[PDB]
Amino acid sequence: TCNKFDLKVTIKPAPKNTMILEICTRYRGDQDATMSILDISMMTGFAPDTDDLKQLANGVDRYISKYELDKAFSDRNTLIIYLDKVSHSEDDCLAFKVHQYFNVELIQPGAVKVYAYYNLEESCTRFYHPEKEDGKLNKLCRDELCRCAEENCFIQKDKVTLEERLDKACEPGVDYVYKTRLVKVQLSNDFDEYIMAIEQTIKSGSDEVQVGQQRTFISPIKCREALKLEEKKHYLMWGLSSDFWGEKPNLSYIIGKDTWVEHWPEEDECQDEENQKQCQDLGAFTESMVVFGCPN
Amino acid sequence: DEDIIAEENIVSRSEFPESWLWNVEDLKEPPKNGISTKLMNIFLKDSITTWEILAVSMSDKKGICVADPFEVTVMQDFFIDLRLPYSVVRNEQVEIRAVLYNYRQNQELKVRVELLHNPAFCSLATTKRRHQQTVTIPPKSSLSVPYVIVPLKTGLQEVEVKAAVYHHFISDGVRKSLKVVPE
Amino acid sequence: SPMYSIITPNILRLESEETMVLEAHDAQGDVPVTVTVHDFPGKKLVLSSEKTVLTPATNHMGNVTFTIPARNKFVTVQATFGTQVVEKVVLVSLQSGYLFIQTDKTIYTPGSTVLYRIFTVNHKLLPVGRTVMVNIENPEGIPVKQDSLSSQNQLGVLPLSWDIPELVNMGQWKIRAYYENSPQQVFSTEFEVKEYVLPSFEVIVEPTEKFYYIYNEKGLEVTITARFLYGKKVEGTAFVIFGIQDGEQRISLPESLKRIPIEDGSGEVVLSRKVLLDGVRAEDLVGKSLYVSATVILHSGSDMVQAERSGIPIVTSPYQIHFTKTPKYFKPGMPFDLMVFVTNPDGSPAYRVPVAVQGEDTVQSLTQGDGVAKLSINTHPSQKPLSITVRTKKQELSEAEQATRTMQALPYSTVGNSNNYLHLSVLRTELRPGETLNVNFLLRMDRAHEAKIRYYTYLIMNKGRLLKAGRQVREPGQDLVVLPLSITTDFIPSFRLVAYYTLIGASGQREVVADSVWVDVKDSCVGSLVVKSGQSEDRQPVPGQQMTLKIEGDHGARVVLVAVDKGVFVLNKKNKLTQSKIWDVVEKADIGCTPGSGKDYAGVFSDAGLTFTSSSGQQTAQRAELQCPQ
Lengths: 296, 183, 630
What we know:
The complex is a heterotrimer.
Chain A (H helix, E strand, L loop, with lengths): L4 E9 L5 E9 L8 E6 L4 E3 L1 H8 L4 E2 L2 H4 L8 E6 L8 E9 L9 E7 L6 E6 L10 E4 L2 E4 L13 H8 L4 E13 L4 E13 L10 E7 L3 H4 L6 E7 L3 E2 L6 E3 L5 E5 L11 H17 L4
Parallel strand pairs in A: 14-17
Antiparallel strand pairs in A: 1-2, 2-7, 3-6, 3-8, 4-7, 5-6, 8-9, 10-11, 12-13, 12-15, 13-14, 15-18, 16-17
Helix pairs in contact in A: 3-5
Chain B lengths: L18 E2 L3 E3 L8 E9 L5 E11 L3 E4 L3 E5 L3 E6 L3 E3 L4 E9 L6 E7 L5 E2 L8 E7 L3 E11 L3 E11 L5 E11 L2
Parallel strand pairs in B: 8-15
Antiparallel strand pairs in B: 4-5, 4-6, 7-9, 9-13, 10-12, 10-14, 11-13, 14-15
Chain C lengths: L2 E5 L3 E3 L4 E2 L1 E5 L5 E9 L11 E4 L6 E2 L2 E2 L6 E9 L2 E10 L4 E6 L3 E2 L4 E9 L9 E7 L5 E8 L6 E7 L7 E9 L7 E7 L7 E7 L4 E2 L6 E9 L7 E11 L2 E4 L5 E5 L3 E6 L1 H6 L10 E10 L5 E12 L4 E3 L6 E2 L5 E8 L10 E4 L7 E2 L5 E6 L8 E7 L12 E7 L9 E6 L9 E9 L10 E8 L2 E9 L6 E7 L7 E11 L5 E11 L8 E5 L12 E9 L3 E8 L2 H4 L7 H10 L12 H7 L5 E2 L16
Parallel strand pairs in C: 2-10, 12-18, 20-27, 29-35
Antiparallel strand pairs in C: 1-4, 1-46, 3-8, 4-7, 5-6, 5-9, 9-10, 11-13, 13-16, 14-15, 14-17, 17-18, 19-21, 21-25, 22-23, 22-24, 22-26, 26-27, 28-30, 30-33, 31-32, 31-34, 34-35, 36-37, 37-40, 38-39, 38-41, 41-42, 43-44
């Protein structure tokens, strides 16, 4: 609720990576706070620019210990900036550059925590991340129920054969396999919606869907480039029943790390002497699943 | 990895009571010069700390005697301090810290530290994907490791992190609970 | 004229062994004594046993020990010596003893269990089986749980528990307990309820002196120590701020706030005299006190601990003088002994502090381990109130920094102006069990009657009972006789000794002359309890490890235990049970009220917690009050 402190944290690319972290804080009193702490954690693989920290340490009403100042690329994963006061009338702002010294996929949000020394309970915390909307992990919420969405965007991508498709679509937890057409894409801030017409139920699961019924598939905006789903195109999709969202008979589908999403070339793109194989593999796959079903 | 205890082979510490040994015993061992001696085998808990043991006797001859407190320090040269808050709110993101301590006098440690997946929490750990950092801790120092998590269910829920060092037979794990409270 | 006398405690207790001292002065042959106890007023005959025979070979001194079963209630004690009836109405206490209450921890979260024990002892501190009422009260004083339990067959230990609801008022909770028969005497512990996690280190804040002297140019100098509960030193940053308390209210000194590095588990901070006085006529500040508040944060920000040292008195002198141990009555014409108690400003005893009476001018004596020094002045035979001022003669100090205190003594009044006195004295050292104390009996009377005094009767009062009575014989012409009194653990935490002689003097006139002295004894357990390691060896235990605890104690004793993470005490270290707290409750329950002597022989007995009644009508005034005067 941040009753005693205003805290805005911002991360932006600077003019390896380097970006600018800006921290803006104000005390909610009729008087200035006295000695207060900025407790800062890094996004994983980032470290403060030391020159930028020296500038800040020389700033009035601020202290950064020699301790912090001759840490390193080594392990300034965390930093404390000591403030001699914080203004109550306007924001006391500061910024510094952060450099990526180790690069990884999946960087955890950093966090900034303000409090006055005398009272650790009356604190404020903000998170930050280069793509996450104010530092927030991805999760899907319905009323007071959330579920985490911090996983791979969908299944994998060395050849894709009929055989692997058949094995994978027949794994014990796979609940539905569809041929779909993308009717409508709805983009938003947090989660994209893809309204698929279900053109055939190759495998039917716990969602009773008639032929040509639309279902809505959901994906985190961070998955948007990797899916590159396009309207009017066809897809082979399958997934687990663990990925349903909502209640019958109005289920949605979460696209997650156990969802197969494959582009199914169009009827007249299948002639191209470079779609032929994939198109026959889809056709044999369908015939096998429609007739034999799954071998266990 | 090459040359490090596997996550599944680490048994996390879990017994962290604030008090224990609330016990009553009569001193009836065959006495010498009026004094009976009792030996008690106790199992120290999992806390790295100093326990204060207080005894009080009651005797129909000597009345009541509060003894001088007895201290026992329980330690280790490498360990995690998992600093969890008392309670957290359902669906609110928090940062907790795992603090890694190296109290070896002149040996610095290359350490792999991991936050375990738990479906009661949203974090960067999944069932199929580990959330593991490799860090170096210098002699006689500590490293604060931050984790961002979101509690997804109320009641008593548990956070667990573990660490092992490369090239040595050193590891640790801490498994602790916190109260998750509704919005 | 054989004179028969009886002596008992001022307040008799129920269901405990009491003693009545019996004497036949100037008797011949054997003398049968039946002692009786009755309800007042009327007759029920509550104690009816108790006869004995007074004897030439025991110099006509003896006993009977008795037990009463089982407004303010009184009994009539009645002694019949041969045919001679001597009787006394005596106040009766409905008290069974004390209750001590122990919790496992000092502080708790909602939804945990308070484990606790009540120890049910009598006034001798021996286990007693009784009905006890228990109440747990919340912060606003509302009772929320009550048990009613007996400690019969239980060796003085009642184990209880209570589960804190998850939905509960934070703050100071209370356990209140009393014996069913004395609802008037209630014993309490407090425990704290609060949401919290254990911290990993402790913070200690030690000023370099336990007081502040207003003319100290250096100000208040303070060390901050931070160490992990397992031993190691903390690296971190401290925020320390000072303030002024008087006496409930605190004024922060905002200009005194400092931020310092904790390096190697340690940091230094000062409150300059200049910042002190700015923040507020320096002498206006004496009598108030200072507090230091420290917040330490690990250099990582990952843990934080607040600590405070408070009640640091602002003084002109490092010392206080107290006459609490000196008798407020003298014998005109005889030397007067003062027991001077010198404390450090916080209340602790001061060791090796020289003291003296106004001027002096040779004189002077040094305070000891217990803070007590012994002085003695000579005294005029006048009846005018004696007024004594003592200081404080610390070299290195200076007159303005020496402590001073004045008191007044009144004359012991004699029988029909006889000018006959008894004076007891005792060397001032710390007395432990195993030592013998020489008790000095100094007689003042005229040579015309002195030879009639052949003995003194002495009585030892301890924990509200007659511990011991005997005789100290005397030869004609002997001004001083000495009693070698053996001190045992029965004499803790302290005791009173009264002596008296009697005679027929002036004109067939029966005279009783009494004195008394209050003696402190070194406090320890009566018995023994040692808790230690049993593994004959080795370095620090590892989590989960098995170790051997060893307990050494008195055969047959019930021992109760608890192990507490010392991180609990970083949060709260108040209300813990301690042997010290037990002796403090004991001495507060003394039925003697005074450091000794009295306004006359009757006052001597009564002030020391004794009755005295003779067949010739010499007796103490009735005590009807269950407490000491104040």
